[PDB]
Structures are given as C-alpha cells and as structure tokens.
Amino acid sequence: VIGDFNCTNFAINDLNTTVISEYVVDVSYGLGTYYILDRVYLNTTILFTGYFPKSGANFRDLSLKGTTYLSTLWYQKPFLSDFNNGIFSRVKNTKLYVNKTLYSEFSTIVIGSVFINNSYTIVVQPHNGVLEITACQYTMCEYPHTICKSKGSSRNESWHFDKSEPLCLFKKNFTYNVSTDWLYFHFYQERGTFYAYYADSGMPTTFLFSLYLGTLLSHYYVLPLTCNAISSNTDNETLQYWVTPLSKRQYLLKFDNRGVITNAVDCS
Ligand SMILES: *[C@@H]1O[C@H](CO)[C@@H](O[C@@H]2O[C@H](CO)[C@@H](O[C@@H]3O[C@H](CO[C@H]4O[C@H](CO)[C@@H](O)[C@H](O)[C@@H]4O)[C@@H](O)[C@H](O[C@H]4O[C@H](CO)[C@@H](O)[C@H](O)[C@@H]4O)[C@@H]3O)[C@H](O)[C@H]2NC(C)=O)[C@H](O)[C@H]1NC(C)=O
Ligand SMILES: *[C@@H]1O[C@H](CO)[C@@H](O[C@@H]2O[C@H](CO)[C@@H](O)[C@H](O)[C@H]2NC(C)=O)[C@H](O)[C@H]1NC(C)=O
Ligand SMILES: *[C@@H]1O[C@H](CO)[C@@H](O)[C@H](O)[C@H]1NC(C)=O
Ligand SMILES: *[C@@H]1O[C@H](CO)[C@@H](O)[C@H](O)[C@H]1NC(C)=O
Ligand SMILES: *[C@@H]1O[C@H](CO)[C@@H](O)[C@H](O)[C@H]1NC(C)=O
Ligand SMILES: *[C@@H]1O[C@H](CO)[C@@H](O)[C@H](O)[C@H]1NC(C)=O
Ligand SMILES: *[C@@H]1O[C@H](CO)[C@@H](O)[C@H](O)[C@H]1NC(C)=O
Ligand SMILES: *[C@@H]1O[C@H](CO)[C@@H](O)[C@H](O)[C@H]1NC(C)=O
C-alpha cells in the first residue's frame, strides 16, 4: 500500500498481468541536463558536476492506466520506488479531444517517506495546463489514483482523505504549454532541501522551486490514472511517465551562440 487510510473497497483485485516497459537514457542531445543557476554560457563547452542521469542507464515507464478495477500489486515494489538522491522524469503529455477542444492529461507523481499525515508528502498533479504542486501532511489512501476530468471515469478520484485542510509547507501553481508533446522534470534532494526543475519546451530543464523539509525523502510513486478513454478500442492514446535515478555526475555541456544546451556527454 501507499498511505494507510481505507478510502474505498470498490472494485479491487490481485491481477498480475502488468510489466514495467524500459527504454535507454541518451543525453547526446541535452536530455537529462539543466540550466546552471542564473548563468548564461555562449558558443562553448563546459565541464560541470550536477545531479544528472547515468547515460546508458534505463528509464522505467511507471505510468498505469486503469478503467474500473485496481490491482493491489500496483501499490508495491517494483512501482513504489526508492528516491535516493533524486529522479529525472520524461513525461508524455497525453493530448485528448472532446468536441474538437484539446485537453492535457498525464500521471500525478507523489514523493515522500511513510505517506502518513504525521509526515509531509510532495504531490505534483496536472489540471489541463496548470501544474499544481503541494507539500502537505496528506492522509494518503491505501490505493491512491486520479481520473480523466476531461473524458470521465467509472470511479471517483481519491488519493487522500483530508476532511479539514491539512498543514502545508508549500502550495503553488505553475502553467505549462498544453500543446507540447513532452515535459521533463528533475526532482532531487540535498541537505534536507528538495529541488525541482522542469521544462515544457526543449529538453534541458530550468528551476521551478526549492523547499526545506529537514527530513530525508525516501520513496516516490506515480499514481494510476483511471479513464473511460486512453485505450486502443476508443482512441489509441497512451500515458507514458519515464523515470530514471539521478546521481552527482560530471558532464560535458555544449552551449550554442544563443545559450541553449544543444549537446551533452556523461564523462563516465
Ligand atoms: C491521520 O491519519 C490516520 C491514519 O494514518 C487517521 O486515523 C484513522 O482514522 C479513521 C477514521 O476515523 C479510523 O477509522 C475508523 O475507526 C473506528 C474504530 O475502529 C475500531 O472499531 C471497528 C468497528 O467499528 C473495528 O473493525 C476496528 O478493528 C477497530 O477495533 C471505526 O469504528 C470506524 O468505522 C466506522 O466508520 C466507517 C467510515 O467509512 C464506516 O464505513 C464503518 O461502517 C463504521 O461506521 C473507522 O474504521 C482509523 O481507525 C484511524 N486509524 C488509526 C491507525 O488511528 C487520522 O484520522 C488522521 N487524522 C486527521 C486529523 O485527519
Ligand atoms: C491552483 O490550481 C488548482 C487547480 O485548478 C486550483 O484549485 C481549484 O480552485 C477552484 C477555485 O477555488 C475550485 O473551484 C476547484 O474546486 C479547485 N480544484 C480543482 C481540482 O479545480 C487552485 O485554486 C489554484 N491555486 C492555488 C493557490 O492552489
Ligand atoms: C475498508 O472499508 C470498508 C467499508 O468500511 C470495509 O468493508 C472494508 O472491510 C475495509 N477494509 C479494511 C482493510 O479496512
Ligand atoms: C505474478 O508475476 C510474478 C512475476 O512474473 C510471478 O513471479 C508470480 O508467480 C505471478 N503470480 C501469478 C499468480 O500470476
Ligand atoms: C562559435 O565558436 C566557433 C569555435 O570557436 C567559431 O568557429 C564560430 O565562428 C563561433 N560563432 C559565433 C557566432 O560565435
Ligand atoms: C462517486 O461519488 C458520488 C457522489 O458522492 C456517489 O453517488 C457514487 O456512489 C460514488 N461512486 C463511487 C464508486 O465511489
Ligand atoms: C506551445 O507548444 C507548441 C508545440 O511545441 C508550439 O508550437 C507553441 O509555439 C507553444 N506555445 C507557447 C505559448 O509556448
Ligand atoms: C487503433 O489503431 C489500429 C491500427 O491502425 C486500428 O486497427 C484501430 O481501429 C485503432 N483504434 C481506434 C479506436 O481508432
């Protein structure tokens, strides 16, 4: 389980027939890199040490799409994952349509330790062009999940059950371009402070925020999304949420004559 609160008994089983899809990290076009502090480098190559993916390591696609039933096995290892120093995410923006109006969906991620309301859980959730980010003492469900608010779902949304508002260290919204095909994120921790970088356009990420927690984060989980759409019998659309571990690595970075990181090399 994530959490421990019994949010519902409705339509749960032990279905085993789901496996992690995997793909190979390739930073040669600047994927997995980020812009350095407030600096601009031009038409040059730099050696820099930062929280980066290992080149040639695997990404794991942790996105889960459901329709009605939830497997208990989705709420365990290998999906419930160790956070260590941090993670890099490559996220497909699943662009749906209703009456020729565009809607943007992708999986929520939660980052935490015990997921009990005596500890802070970070949550990053899309709301169709608004990225809502919070860090609160959420009463996380045993079996948390989200819904397609655009197309609808056979079950209600539930990932926490707080009746009164919980205590929060952080709560902000960031806009993102709903038309882009991919979002990139770095989430990492150093000396009890969490750091988030993202990009909605291009591959190199840029700083969103940092947050003092004092405590070590230890786990992350990508919430199942339940939808009446997003499948081969209705639209051929898919979720994808690729993650890979960060570590403190030395990279070569190449900046063009307008300060964009165009290429990188993991030196080991
Ligand atoms: C912070 O987060 C913690 C969890 O980490 C929350 O603590 C839980 O809170 C819930 C809701 O109050 C508790 O659930 C309720 O427990 C009652 C007592 O359980 C005993 O009695 C039942 C029989 O009634 C036995 O089966 C059981 O083994 C225990 O011996 C139950 O009486 C409640 O059931 C009633 O309400 C539900 C509501 O859905 C109905 O469906 C039932 O029919 C029935 O009417 C209910 O189960 C839970 O026990 C708490 N857990 C712990 C570990 O304390 C905190 O509430 C939360 N704090 C804040 C501020 O949000
Ligand atoms: C951040 O974005 C969220 C999601 O859009 C906003 O939450 C909604 O706010 C309206 C107006 O108060 C409510 O009617 C909705 O019920 C809220 N939830 C959802 C899921 O839409 C939120 O107001 C924004 N701002 C902040 C500071 O959180
Ligand atoms: C969860 O809640 C329902 C309704 O109260 C109950 O029937 C079910 O036995 C509960 N399961 C657990 C593990 O608490
Ligand atoms: C579930 O899948 C795992 C991993 O392949 C396997 O070890 C296990 O025996 C399976 N159990 C059932 C009942 O399918
Ligand atoms: C960029 O750097 C290369 C290598 O020094 C040089 O040949 C080129 O003229 C430079 N171009 C600009 C626009 O600075
Ligand atoms: C969803 O919420 C509505 C309104 O509270 C309720 O009527 C319905 O029974 C709920 N269904 C489930 C599966 O939770
Ligand atoms: C949004 O993304 C699309 C596709 O990448 C791009 O054509 C468009 O210019 C972007 N708009 C904004 C405001 O960034
Ligand atoms: C999904 O793609 C396949 C191959 O093109 C096609 O047979 C199928 O009908 C498509 N499904 C929908 C809902 O269009």
CSV table of C-alpha atoms and ligand atoms in Angstrom, one decimal:
chain,number,residue,atom,x,y,z
A,1,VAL,CA,0.0,0.0,0.0
A,2,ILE,CA,0.9,3.7,-0.3
A,3,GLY,CA,-0.6,5.5,2.8
A,4,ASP,CA,-2.8,3.5,5.2
A,5,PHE,CA,-6.3,5.1,5.0
A,6,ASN,CA,-9.2,3.0,3.7
A,7,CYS,CA,-10.7,5.4,1.1
A,8,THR,CA,-12.8,2.7,-0.7
A,9,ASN,CA,-13.3,-1.1,-1.0
A,10,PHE,CA,-14.8,-0.7,-4.5
A,11,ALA,CA,-13.5,-2.9,-7.3
A,12,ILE,CA,-10.0,-4.0,-6.1
A,13,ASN,CA,-8.3,-7.3,-7.1
A,14,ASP,CA,-4.9,-9.0,-7.3
A,15,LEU,CA,-4.4,-9.0,-11.1
A,16,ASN,CA,-0.8,-9.7,-12.0
A,17,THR,CA,-0.7,-9.0,-15.9
A,18,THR,CA,1.3,-5.7,-15.9
A,19,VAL,CA,5.0,-5.2,-16.5
A,20,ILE,CA,7.4,-2.2,-16.5
A,21,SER,CA,8.4,-1.1,-20.0
A,22,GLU,CA,12.0,0.1,-20.3
A,23,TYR,CA,14.0,2.5,-22.6
A,24,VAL,CA,17.7,3.7,-22.7
A,25,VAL,CA,18.9,7.1,-21.5
A,26,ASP,CA,20.7,9.1,-24.2
A,27,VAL,CA,21.9,12.6,-23.2
A,28,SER,CA,23.7,13.4,-26.5
A,29,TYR,CA,21.0,16.0,-27.4
A,30,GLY,CA,20.9,17.6,-23.9
A,31,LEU,CA,18.2,15.3,-22.4
A,32,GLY,CA,18.7,15.0,-18.6
A,33,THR,CA,20.6,18.3,-18.3
A,34,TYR,CA,19.6,21.6,-16.7
A,35,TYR,CA,20.5,25.3,-16.9
A,36,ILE,CA,23.1,26.4,-14.3
A,37,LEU,CA,21.8,28.8,-11.6
A,38,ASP,CA,21.4,32.2,-13.2
A,39,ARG,CA,24.4,31.9,-15.5
A,40,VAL,CA,24.5,32.2,-19.4
A,41,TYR,CA,27.3,30.5,-21.3
A,42,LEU,CA,27.6,31.1,-25.1
A,43,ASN,CA,29.1,29.2,-28.0
A,44,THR,CA,31.3,27.0,-25.7
A,45,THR,CA,31.8,23.6,-24.0
A,46,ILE,CA,31.9,23.4,-20.1
A,47,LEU,CA,32.7,20.6,-17.7
A,48,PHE,CA,30.1,20.8,-14.9
A,49,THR,CA,29.2,18.5,-12.0
A,50,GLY,CA,25.4,18.2,-11.2
A,51,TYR,CA,22.5,15.9,-10.4
A,52,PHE,CA,22.3,14.0,-13.7
A,53,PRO,CA,21.1,10.7,-15.2
A,54,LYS,CA,23.7,8.0,-15.9
A,55,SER,CA,23.9,7.8,-19.7
A,56,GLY,CA,23.1,4.3,-20.9
A,57,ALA,CA,21.0,3.5,-17.8
A,58,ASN,CA,17.4,2.6,-18.3
A,59,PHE,CA,14.3,4.6,-17.9
A,60,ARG,CA,11.2,2.8,-16.5
A,61,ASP,CA,7.7,3.7,-17.7
A,62,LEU,CA,5.8,3.8,-14.4
A,63,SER,CA,2.5,5.2,-15.9
A,64,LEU,CA,-0.5,2.9,-15.1
A,65,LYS,CA,-3.9,3.4,-17.0
A,66,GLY,CA,-7.0,1.7,-15.4
A,67,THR,CA,-10.7,1.6,-16.4
A,68,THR,CA,-12.6,0.2,-13.3
A,69,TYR,CA,-10.6,-2.4,-11.3
A,70,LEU,CA,-7.4,-1.6,-9.4
A,71,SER,CA,-4.7,-4.2,-8.8
A,72,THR,CA,-3.3,-4.3,-5.3
A,73,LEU,CA,0.1,-5.2,-7.0
A,74,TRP,CA,0.3,-1.7,-8.5
A,75,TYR,CA,0.8,-0.4,-4.9
A,76,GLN,CA,4.0,-2.3,-4.1
A,77,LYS,CA,7.6,-2.8,-5.5
A,78,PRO,CA,8.6,-2.5,-8.3
A,79,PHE,CA,6.3,0.5,-8.7
A,80,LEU,CA,6.7,2.1,-5.2
A,81,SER,CA,10.3,3.2,-5.8
A,82,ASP,CA,13.4,4.3,-3.7
A,83,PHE,CA,14.1,8.1,-4.2
A,84,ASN,CA,17.8,8.2,-3.1
A,85,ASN,CA,19.4,11.5,-4.4
A,86,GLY,CA,16.6,12.1,-6.9
A,87,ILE,CA,14.9,11.2,-10.3
A,88,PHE,CA,14.7,12.6,-13.8
A,89,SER,CA,11.2,12.3,-15.5
A,90,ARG,CA,10.4,12.3,-19.2
A,91,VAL,CA,6.6,12.6,-19.4
A,92,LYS,CA,4.3,12.3,-22.4
A,93,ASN,CA,1.6,14.9,-22.4
A,94,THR,CA,-1.5,12.8,-23.4
A,95,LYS,CA,-3.5,15.3,-25.6
A,96,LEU,CA,-7.1,14.2,-25.7
A,97,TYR,CA,-10.0,15.9,-27.5
A,98,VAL,CA,-13.7,16.5,-26.7
A,99,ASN,CA,-15.9,18.3,-29.4
A,100,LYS,CA,-12.5,19.3,-31.1
A,101,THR,CA,-11.3,21.1,-27.9
A,102,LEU,CA,-7.9,19.9,-26.6
A,103,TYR,CA,-7.4,18.6,-23.0
A,104,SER,CA,-4.0,17.7,-21.5
A,105,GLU,CA,-3.7,14.6,-19.1
A,106,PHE,CA,-0.7,12.9,-17.5
A,107,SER,CA,0.1,10.9,-14.3
A,108,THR,CA,0.4,12.6,-10.9
A,109,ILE,CA,3.6,11.8,-9.0
A,110,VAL,CA,3.9,11.7,-5.2
A,111,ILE,CA,7.2,11.9,-3.3
A,112,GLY,CA,7.5,11.2,0.4
A,113,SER,CA,8.6,8.8,3.2
A,114,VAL,CA,5.9,7.0,5.2
A,115,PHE,CA,2.9,8.7,3.4
A,116,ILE,CA,1.1,9.1,6.8
A,117,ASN,CA,-0.4,12.5,7.9
A,118,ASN,CA,2.4,13.0,10.5
A,119,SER,CA,4.9,13.5,7.6
A,120,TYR,CA,4.9,15.7,4.5
A,121,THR,CA,4.2,14.3,1.1
A,122,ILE,CA,5.0,16.3,-2.1
A,123,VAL,CA,2.4,16.0,-4.8
A,124,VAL,CA,2.8,17.2,-8.5
A,125,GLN,CA,-0.5,17.0,-10.4
A,126,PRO,CA,-1.7,18.4,-13.8
A,127,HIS,CA,-5.0,20.2,-14.2
A,128,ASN,CA,-5.1,20.8,-18.0
A,129,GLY,CA,-2.3,23.5,-18.4
A,130,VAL,CA,-2.0,24.2,-14.7
A,131,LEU,CA,0.6,22.1,-12.8
A,132,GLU,CA,-0.5,22.1,-9.1
A,133,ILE,CA,2.4,21.4,-6.7
A,134,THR,CA,1.9,21.0,-3.0
A,135,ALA,CA,3.7,19.6,0.1
A,136,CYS,CA,1.3,18.7,2.9
A,137,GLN,CA,0.6,16.2,5.7
A,138,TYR,CA,-1.9,14.4,3.4
A,139,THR,CA,-3.9,11.4,4.7
A,140,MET,CA,-2.8,9.3,1.7
A,141,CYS,CA,-5.2,6.4,0.7
A,142,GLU,CA,-4.1,2.7,0.7
A,143,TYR,CA,-4.8,2.6,-3.1
A,144,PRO,CA,-4.4,6.2,-4.4
A,145,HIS,CA,-5.4,7.1,-8.0
A,146,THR,CA,-6.5,10.1,-10.3
A,147,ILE,CA,-9.2,10.4,-13.0
A,148,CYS,CA,-9.6,11.8,-16.5
A,149,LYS,CA,-11.5,15.0,-15.6
A,150,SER,CA,-12.0,15.6,-19.4
A,151,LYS,CA,-13.4,12.2,-20.6
A,152,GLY,CA,-14.6,10.9,-17.2
A,153,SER,CA,-14.0,7.6,-15.3
A,154,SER,CA,-16.1,4.7,-13.8
A,155,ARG,CA,-14.9,5.6,-10.3
A,156,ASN,CA,-14.4,8.9,-8.3
A,157,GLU,CA,-11.0,10.5,-7.7
A,158,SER,CA,-9.2,9.6,-4.4
A,159,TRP,CA,-5.5,9.8,-3.4
A,160,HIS,CA,-6.0,11.4,0.0
A,161,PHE,CA,-8.8,11.7,2.6
A,162,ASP,CA,-8.4,15.0,4.5
A,163,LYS,CA,-11.8,16.4,5.5
A,164,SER,CA,-10.4,19.6,7.1
A,165,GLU,CA,-7.4,21.2,5.2
A,166,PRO,CA,-4.0,19.6,6.1
A,167,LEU,CA,-0.9,21.6,7.2
A,168,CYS,CA,1.2,22.5,4.1
A,169,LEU,CA,4.9,23.7,3.8
A,170,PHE,CA,4.3,24.6,0.1
A,171,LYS,CA,1.4,25.2,-2.4
A,172,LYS,CA,1.9,26.8,-5.8
A,173,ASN,CA,0.6,26.6,-9.4
A,174,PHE,CA,2.9,26.7,-12.5
A,175,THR,CA,1.4,27.0,-16.0
A,176,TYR,CA,2.7,24.7,-18.8
A,177,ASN,CA,2.1,24.7,-22.6
A,178,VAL,CA,-0.8,22.1,-23.2
A,179,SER,CA,0.3,21.8,-26.9
A,180,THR,CA,3.8,20.4,-26.2
A,181,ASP,CA,4.3,16.6,-26.6
A,182,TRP,CA,6.8,16.1,-23.7
A,183,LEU,CA,7.5,17.5,-20.2
A,184,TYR,CA,10.9,17.0,-18.4
A,185,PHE,CA,11.5,17.2,-14.6
A,186,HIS,CA,14.4,16.9,-12.2
A,187,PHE,CA,13.4,16.2,-8.6
A,188,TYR,CA,16.3,15.9,-6.2
A,189,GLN,CA,17.3,16.4,-2.5
A,190,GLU,CA,20.4,17.9,-0.9
A,191,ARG,CA,21.0,18.5,2.9
A,192,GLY,CA,17.3,18.1,3.7
A,193,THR,CA,16.1,20.6,1.0
A,194,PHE,CA,14.1,19.4,-2.1
A,195,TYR,CA,14.7,20.9,-5.5
A,196,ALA,CA,12.5,20.8,-8.6
A,197,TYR,CA,13.5,21.8,-12.2
A,198,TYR,CA,11.2,21.4,-15.3
A,199,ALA,CA,10.8,22.1,-19.0
A,200,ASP,CA,7.7,22.0,-21.1
A,201,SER,CA,9.6,23.1,-24.3
A,202,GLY,CA,13.0,21.8,-25.3
A,203,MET,CA,14.9,19.1,-23.3
A,204,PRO,CA,17.2,21.0,-20.8
A,205,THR,CA,15.2,21.8,-17.6
A,206,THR,CA,15.1,25.0,-15.6
A,207,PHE,CA,14.5,25.7,-11.8
A,208,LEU,CA,10.9,25.8,-10.5
A,209,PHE,CA,11.3,25.9,-6.7
A,210,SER,CA,13.2,24.6,-3.7
A,211,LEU,CA,11.7,23.5,-0.3
A,212,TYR,CA,13.3,22.9,3.1
A,213,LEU,CA,11.9,19.7,4.6
A,214,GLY,CA,14.6,18.9,7.2
A,215,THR,CA,13.7,15.1,6.8
A,216,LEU,CA,15.1,12.7,4.2
A,217,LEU,CA,12.6,11.8,1.4
A,218,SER,CA,12.8,8.0,0.7
A,219,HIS,CA,10.1,7.0,-1.8
A,220,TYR,CA,8.2,8.1,-4.8
A,221,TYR,CA,5.2,6.7,-6.6
A,222,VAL,CA,3.4,7.5,-9.9
A,223,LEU,CA,-0.4,7.4,-9.4
A,224,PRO,CA,-2.5,5.2,-11.6
A,225,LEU,CA,-5.0,7.2,-13.7
A,226,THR,CA,-8.5,5.8,-14.4
A,227,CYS,CA,-10.3,6.8,-17.6
A,228,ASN,CA,-13.1,5.7,-19.9
A,229,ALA,CA,-10.8,6.9,-22.8
A,230,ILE,CA,-7.0,6.3,-23.4
A,231,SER,CA,-7.1,2.8,-25.0
A,232,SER,CA,-6.8,1.0,-28.3
A,233,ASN,CA,-10.6,0.3,-28.6
A,234,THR,CA,-11.5,4.0,-28.1
A,235,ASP,CA,-8.7,6.4,-29.2
A,236,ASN,CA,-5.2,4.7,-29.4
A,237,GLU,CA,-3.9,7.2,-26.9
A,238,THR,CA,-1.5,6.3,-24.1
A,239,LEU,CA,0.1,7.6,-20.9
A,240,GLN,CA,3.9,7.4,-20.5
A,241,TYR,CA,5.9,8.5,-17.4
A,242,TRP,CA,9.5,7.5,-17.8
A,243,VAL,CA,11.8,7.9,-14.7
A,244,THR,CA,15.5,7.2,-14.1
A,245,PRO,CA,17.7,7.8,-11.0
A,246,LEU,CA,19.8,11.0,-10.6
A,247,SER,CA,23.3,11.0,-9.1
A,248,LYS,CA,26.2,13.5,-8.7
A,249,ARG,CA,28.0,13.2,-12.1
A,250,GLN,CA,30.4,15.2,-14.3
A,251,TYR,CA,29.0,16.2,-17.7
A,252,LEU,CA,30.4,18.0,-20.7
A,253,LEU,CA,27.7,20.5,-21.7
A,254,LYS,CA,27.7,22.4,-25.1
A,255,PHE,CA,26.0,25.8,-25.4
A,256,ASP,CA,25.2,27.3,-28.8
A,257,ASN,CA,25.5,31.0,-29.8
A,258,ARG,CA,22.1,31.8,-28.1
A,259,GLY,CA,22.8,30.0,-24.8
A,260,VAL,CA,20.7,26.8,-25.4
A,261,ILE,CA,22.3,23.5,-24.3
A,262,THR,CA,22.3,21.5,-27.6
A,263,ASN,CA,24.5,18.5,-26.6
A,264,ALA,CA,26.0,16.8,-23.5
A,265,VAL,CA,28.3,13.9,-22.6
A,266,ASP,CA,28.3,11.9,-19.5
A,267,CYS,CA,32.1,11.6,-18.9
A,268,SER,CA,31.9,8.1,-17.4
B,1,LIG,C1,-4.4,10.9,10.2
B,1,LIG,O1,-4.3,9.6,9.6
B,1,LIG,C2,-4.7,8.5,10.4
B,1,LIG,C3,-4.4,7.2,9.7
B,1,LIG,O2,-3.0,7.1,9.4
B,1,LIG,C4,-6.2,8.6,10.7
B,1,LIG,O3,-6.6,7.6,11.7
B,1,LIG,C5,-7.6,6.7,11.2
B,1,LIG,O4,-8.9,7.4,11.1
B,1,LIG,C6,-10.0,6.6,10.7
B,1,LIG,C7,-11.3,7.5,10.6
B,1,LIG,O5,-11.6,8.0,11.9
B,1,LIG,C8,-10.2,5.4,11.6
B,1,LIG,O6,-11.2,4.5,11.0
B,1,LIG,C9,-12.4,4.3,11.9
B,1,LIG,O7,-12.0,3.5,13.1
B,1,LIG,C10,-13.1,3.2,14.0
B,1,LIG,C11,-12.5,2.4,15.2
B,1,LIG,O8,-12.0,1.1,14.7
B,1,LIG,C12,-12.2,0.0,15.6
B,1,LIG,O9,-13.6,-0.5,15.6
B,1,LIG,C13,-14.0,-1.2,14.3
B,1,LIG,C14,-15.5,-1.5,14.3
B,1,LIG,O10,-16.2,-0.2,14.3
B,1,LIG,C15,-13.1,-2.4,14.2
B,1,LIG,O11,-13.4,-3.1,12.9
B,1,LIG,C16,-11.6,-2.0,14.1
B,1,LIG,O12,-10.8,-3.1,14.0
B,1,LIG,C17,-11.3,-1.2,15.4
B,1,LIG,O13,-11.2,-2.1,16.5
B,1,LIG,C18,-14.3,2.5,13.3
B,1,LIG,O14,-15.4,2.4,14.2
B,1,LIG,C19,-14.7,3.3,12.0
B,1,LIG,O15,-15.7,2.6,11.3
B,1,LIG,C20,-16.9,3.4,11.1
B,1,LIG,O16,-16.8,4.4,10.1
B,1,LIG,C21,-16.6,3.9,8.7
B,1,LIG,C22,-16.4,5.2,7.8
B,1,LIG,O17,-16.1,4.8,6.5
B,1,LIG,C23,-17.8,3.1,8.3
B,1,LIG,O18,-17.6,2.6,7.0
B,1,LIG,C24,-18.0,1.9,9.3
B,1,LIG,O19,-19.2,1.2,9.0
B,1,LIG,C25,-18.1,2.4,10.7
B,1,LIG,O20,-19.4,3.1,10.9
B,1,LIG,C26,-13.5,3.6,11.1
B,1,LIG,O21,-13.0,2.3,10.6
B,1,LIG,C27,-8.9,4.6,11.7
B,1,LIG,O22,-9.1,3.5,12.7
B,1,LIG,C28,-7.7,5.5,12.2
B,1,LIG,N1,-6.5,4.7,12.2
B,1,LIG,C29,-5.6,4.9,13.1
B,1,LIG,C30,-4.3,4.0,13.0
B,1,LIG,O23,-5.7,5.6,14.1
B,1,LIG,C31,-6.5,10.0,11.3
B,1,LIG,O24,-7.9,10.1,11.5
B,1,LIG,C32,-5.9,11.2,10.5
B,1,LIG,N2,-6.0,12.4,11.3
B,1,LIG,C33,-6.6,13.5,10.7
B,1,LIG,C34,-6.6,14.8,11.6
B,1,LIG,O25,-7.1,13.5,9.6
B,2,LIG,C1,-4.2,26.1,-8.4
B,2,LIG,O1,-4.9,25.3,-9.4
B,2,LIG,C2,-5.9,24.5,-8.8
B,2,LIG,C3,-6.5,23.5,-9.9
B,2,LIG,O2,-7.1,24.3,-10.9
B,2,LIG,C4,-7.0,25.4,-8.2
B,2,LIG,O3,-8.0,24.6,-7.5
B,2,LIG,C5,-9.4,24.8,-7.9
B,2,LIG,O4,-9.8,26.1,-7.4
B,2,LIG,C6,-11.2,26.4,-7.7
B,2,LIG,C7,-11.5,27.9,-7.2
B,2,LIG,O5,-11.2,28.0,-5.8
B,2,LIG,C8,-12.1,25.4,-7.1
B,2,LIG,O6,-13.5,25.6,-7.5
B,2,LIG,C9,-11.7,24.0,-7.5
B,2,LIG,O7,-12.6,23.0,-6.8
B,2,LIG,C10,-10.2,23.7,-7.2
B,2,LIG,N1,-9.8,22.3,-7.5
B,2,LIG,C11,-9.8,21.8,-8.7
B,2,LIG,C12,-9.3,20.4,-8.9
B,2,LIG,O8,-10.1,22.5,-9.7
B,2,LIG,C13,-6.4,26.4,-7.2
B,2,LIG,O9,-7.4,27.3,-6.8
B,2,LIG,C14,-5.2,27.1,-7.8
B,2,LIG,N2,-4.5,28.0,-6.9
B,2,LIG,C15,-3.9,27.6,-5.7
B,2,LIG,C16,-3.2,28.7,-4.9
B,2,LIG,O10,-3.9,26.4,-5.4
B,3,LIG,C1,-12.4,-0.8,4.1
B,3,LIG,O1,-13.7,-0.1,4.3
B,3,LIG,C2,-15.0,-0.9,4.0
B,3,LIG,C3,-16.2,-0.1,4.4
B,3,LIG,O2,-16.0,0.4,5.8
B,3,LIG,C4,-14.9,-2.3,4.8
B,3,LIG,O3,-15.9,-3.1,4.3
B,3,LIG,C5,-13.6,-3.0,4.5
B,3,LIG,O4,-13.6,-4.2,5.2
B,3,LIG,C6,-12.4,-2.1,4.9
B,3,LIG,N1,-11.1,-2.8,4.7
B,3,LIG,C7,-10.1,-2.6,5.5
B,3,LIG,C8,-8.8,-3.4,5.2
B,3,LIG,O5,-10.1,-1.8,6.5
B,4,LIG,C1,2.9,-12.8,-10.8
B,4,LIG,O1,4.0,-12.3,-11.5
B,4,LIG,C2,5.3,-12.7,-10.9
B,4,LIG,C3,6.4,-12.0,-11.8
B,4,LIG,O2,6.5,-12.5,-13.1
B,4,LIG,C4,5.5,-14.2,-10.8
B,4,LIG,O3,6.7,-14.5,-10.0
B,4,LIG,C5,4.3,-14.8,-10.0
B,4,LIG,O4,4.4,-16.2,-9.9
B,4,LIG,C6,2.9,-14.4,-10.7
B,4,LIG,N1,1.8,-14.9,-10.0
B,4,LIG,C7,0.6,-15.2,-10.5
B,4,LIG,C8,-0.4,-15.9,-9.6
B,4,LIG,O5,0.4,-15.0,-11.7
B,5,LIG,C1,31.4,29.8,-32.4
B,5,LIG,O1,32.6,29.1,-32.0
B,5,LIG,C2,33.4,28.5,-33.1
B,5,LIG,C3,34.6,27.8,-32.5
B,5,LIG,O2,35.4,28.7,-31.8
B,5,LIG,C4,33.7,29.6,-34.1
B,5,LIG,O3,34.3,29.0,-35.3
B,5,LIG,C5,32.4,30.3,-34.6
B,5,LIG,O4,32.8,31.4,-35.5
B,5,LIG,C6,31.7,30.9,-33.4
B,5,LIG,N1,30.4,31.5,-33.8
B,5,LIG,C7,29.8,32.5,-33.2
B,5,LIG,C8,28.6,33.1,-33.8
B,5,LIG,O5,30.3,32.9,-32.1
B,6,LIG,C1,-19.0,8.6,-6.6
B,6,LIG,O1,-19.5,9.8,-5.9
B,6,LIG,C2,-20.9,10.0,-6.0
B,6,LIG,C3,-21.3,11.3,-5.3
B,6,LIG,O2,-20.9,11.3,-3.9
B,6,LIG,C4,-21.6,8.8,-5.4
B,6,LIG,O3,-23.1,8.8,-5.7
B,6,LIG,C5,-21.1,7.5,-6.1
B,6,LIG,O4,-21.8,6.3,-5.4
B,6,LIG,C6,-19.6,7.4,-6.0
B,6,LIG,N1,-19.1,6.2,-6.6
B,6,LIG,C7,-18.0,5.5,-6.2
B,6,LIG,C8,-17.7,4.2,-6.9
B,6,LIG,O5,-17.3,6.0,-5.3
B,7,LIG,C1,3.3,25.5,-27.3
B,7,LIG,O1,3.8,24.3,-27.9
B,7,LIG,C2,3.7,24.2,-29.4
B,7,LIG,C3,4.2,22.9,-29.9
B,7,LIG,O2,5.6,22.7,-29.4
B,7,LIG,C4,4.4,25.4,-30.0
B,7,LIG,O3,4.1,25.4,-31.5
B,7,LIG,C5,3.8,26.7,-29.5
B,7,LIG,O4,4.5,27.9,-30.1
B,7,LIG,C6,3.9,26.8,-28.0
B,7,LIG,N1,3.3,28.0,-27.4
B,7,LIG,C7,3.7,28.6,-26.4
B,7,LIG,C8,2.9,29.8,-25.9
B,7,LIG,O5,4.8,28.3,-25.8
B,8,LIG,C1,-6.0,1.8,-33.4
B,8,LIG,O1,-5.0,1.6,-34.4
B,8,LIG,C2,-5.2,0.4,-35.2
B,8,LIG,C3,-4.1,0.3,-36.3
B,8,LIG,O2,-4.2,1.4,-37.1
B,8,LIG,C4,-6.6,0.3,-35.7
B,8,LIG,O3,-6.9,-1.0,-36.3
B,8,LIG,C5,-7.7,0.6,-34.7
B,8,LIG,O4,-9.0,0.5,-35.3
B,8,LIG,C6,-7.4,1.9,-34.0
B,8,LIG,N1,-8.4,2.2,-33.0
B,8,LIG,C7,-9.2,3.3,-33.0
B,8,LIG,C8,-10.2,3.4,-31.8
B,8,LIG,O5,-9.2,4.1,-33.9
